[PDB]
Design a protein around this nucleic acid. Structure first.
Ligand SMILES: Nc1ccn([C@H]2C[C@H](O)[C@@H](COP(=O)(O)NP(=O)(O)OP(=O)(O)O)O2)c(=O)n1
Ligand SMILES: [Mn+2]
Ligand SMILES: [Mn+2]
Length: 379
DNA sequence: CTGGGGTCCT
DNA sequence: AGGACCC
């Protein structure tokens, strides 16, 4: 009952796409910028001291020759993301999306088929593809080792098909659950892959230096844990289950403490088509209801094109704003006749609705720093 | 000088 | 509606 899971994360995703569009960027330190944030950078810029999510001020301070490309339009990145996901769905149907650039694939059934097609003379010729975490020795008589090696071969075929068909590189990790497959994928970067044999699990789990590095333990949970003297993976491993339950609830406590041991029972879920579409816009200041109406119009145009391309109709609309110096949202169902009309001047009705919601949140009789629109409840 | 997105749970 | 998490 031991699964084989692969996790794939693309190398400097946005920067890789922009480097594909303009090959002249391939040999220069490249950073992809959104507002005042260098959201990612190619390997050249990373060598010169630029890091992901660094200030544009600090990024040019570390590397003044940095070339900057605007990436506030995620259209290309989204297209390429779904091409990667589809290509992986060619291998096994059940592919889970995390972010635009990460995918889990459950290789168990495929691995089993490959092993059944094999015979004894070949069964000793099974070899790993890529790195083995911690240089750990392979025991070809351990069925888990054999299955994970086959999983590494499948992962290699996946990366190669990604480069040949899509011109994209990434790192893969092969393990027995999603947490470990994600934790081991980034050990060797970029454009490499790593397989984790069971014997090294604990090693991996103890190579982390704080609990926030565990997928599942975010900012709030991390701060609450720090408030209890829990700072290492082993602190959380050994901490009292009961105090943990009282401090975080039963759910969070049991899940994250089981995560501290490298145990992740969660299955790989079919992500399928998106559950929502949304567009954002940030600014230093918004003070005019007419200006807010214009920005909202902008968001609506692109969202309408996207939904029209999708072929499904959203049955709920949401408006989100941020106030000066928290985020607030109002949503409502989309009228049925507008839903059927999708594909007339749908603009005007939609703008009227979202303006009504806006007035519900804001008093025209202000200073806003974020306007966002969402289409959810897709059919 | 802190983006532009997504998921699910309450 | 808001909040936790993910990239
Ligand atoms: N907070 C974040 C994190 C990622 N992203 C976008 C930019 C990234 O190119 C893309 C993937 O994020 P990422 O995997 O965390 N780092 P990236 O893939 O750029 O480089 P690697 O570290 O994976 O080589 O999502 C973002 O816009 N905001
Ligand atoms: Mn990633
Ligand atoms: Mn990545």
């Amino acid at each position: 009952s031991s699964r084989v899971i692969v996790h794939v994360d693309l190398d400097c995703f946005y920067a890789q796409v922009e480097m594909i569009s303009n090959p002249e960027l391939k040999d220069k330190p490249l950073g992809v910028q959104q507002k005042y944030l260098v959201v990612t950078c190619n390997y050249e810029a990373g060598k010169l001291g630029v890091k992901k999510l660094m200030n544009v001020r600090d990024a040019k301070e570390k590397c003044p020759q940095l070339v900057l490309v605007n990436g506030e339009d995620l259209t290309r990145y989204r297209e390429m993301s779904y091409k990667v996901t589809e290509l992986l769905e060619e291998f096994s149907p059940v592919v889970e999306r995390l972010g635009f650039d990460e995918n889990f694939v459950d290789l168990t059934e495929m691995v089993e088929k490959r092993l059944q097609q094999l015979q004894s003379d070949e069964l000793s010729a099974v070899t790993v593809s890529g790195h083995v975490y911690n240089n750990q020795s392979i025991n070809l008589l351990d069925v888990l080792h054999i299955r994970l090696l086959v999983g590494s071969q499948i992962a290699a075929e996946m990366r190669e098909a990604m480069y040949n068909q899509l011109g994209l590189t990434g790192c893969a990790g092969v393990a027995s659950n999603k947490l470990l497959a994600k934790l081991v994928s980034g050990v060797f970067k970029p454009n490499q892959q790593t397989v984790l044999l069971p014997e090294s699990c604990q090693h991996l789990i103890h190579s982390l230096n704080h609990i926030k590095e565990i997928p599942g333990i975010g900012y709030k949970t991390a701060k609450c844990l720090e408030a209890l003297g829990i700072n290492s993976v082993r602190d959380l491993q050994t901490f009292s289950p009961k105090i943990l339950e009282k401090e975080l609830g039963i759910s969070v406590a049991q899940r994250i403490q089981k995560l501290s041991f490298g145990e992740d029972n969660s299955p790989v879920i079919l992500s399928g088509p998106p559950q929502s579409f949304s567009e954002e816009d940030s600014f230093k200041k918004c003070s005019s209801e007419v200006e807010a109406k214009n920005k909202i119009e902008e968001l609506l145009a692109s969202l309408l094109n996207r939904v029209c391309q999708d072929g499904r109709k959203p049955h709920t609309v949401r408006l989100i704003i941020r106030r000066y110096s928290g985020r607030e949202s109002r949503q409502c169902p989309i009228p049925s006749h507008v839903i059927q009309k999708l594909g007339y001047d749908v603009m005007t009705p939609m703008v009227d609705i979202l303006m009504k919601l806006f007035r519900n949140m804001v008093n025209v009789k202000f200073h806003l720093t974020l306007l966002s629109v969402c289409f959810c409840n897709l059919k």
